[PDB]
Amino acid sequence: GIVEQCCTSICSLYQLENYCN
Amino acid sequence: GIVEQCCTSICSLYQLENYCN
Amino acid sequence: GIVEQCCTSICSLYQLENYCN
Amino acid sequence: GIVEQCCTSICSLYQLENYCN
Amino acid sequence: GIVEQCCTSICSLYQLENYCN
Amino acid sequence: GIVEQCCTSICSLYQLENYCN
Amino acid sequence: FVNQHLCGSHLVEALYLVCGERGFFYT
Amino acid sequence: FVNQHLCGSHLVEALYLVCGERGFFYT
Amino acid sequence: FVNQHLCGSHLVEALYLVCGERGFFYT
Amino acid sequence: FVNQHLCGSHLVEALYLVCGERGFFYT
Amino acid sequence: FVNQHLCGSHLVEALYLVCGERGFFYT
Amino acid sequence: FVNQHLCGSHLVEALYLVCGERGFFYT
């Protein structure tokens, strides 16, 4: 979940690249 | 500056970081 | 106002439409 | 996609809602 | 309206405040 | 900086303009 | 359009989306 | 909703408002 | 406020910022 | 950039900045 | 506008509305 | 260029998102 990897826990912007379509 | 780099043309995330204090 | 109706209380499409001119 | 429907052209709420989960 | 004054043309802070409550 | 002046203290129009380049 | 609490800028954006150029009042 | 173009982050904001906690797919 | 044009969401956002609690009438 | 967890509309903002018109799933 | 504390995004948006393409240092 | 130009308020928002309270230079 993007929320666990980014809201519940700290994530970097580069990590979001894996969530693009 | 960052305007000409990101608005006029297209820039990347690292170019933005170049303008952080 | 609309803030009391939509922020403090629960908002809805119908409520938003009522504040249009 | 949604950008062709809503940005290039004009879309309705119904169309927009089609992209909700 | 405000659109004609601030979008179609360039308005000043004073003009923009004309629409505050 | 402006953050300390406007966020920690109060600043008006002519205070923000002082920070424009 | 889901029912929910809409506050601040989001409420302002919601009114613009719904009303558009009809214009609207925010209070 | 109204009759206007929704582009860039404005379109993403529209999706965020209309879909709420259900989420959405920007595709 | 100054020089540039303000349309759509940006105009309503500028109104929200400038007027604040007082509210405003987008018309 | 060394930001901590992104939540709500802030996470959505970050997704659009990185993904752009590639699209993304917000669920 | 309204004499009150301006923080975060509120402050960044206020400086852009006031300074515009004149530029500014947000520190 | 799946990623579009960042101008005006959108460029300032992106800078704040990336730089944070530490600050940035809009020039």
Ligand SMILES: [Zn+2]
């Ligand atoms: Zn815009």
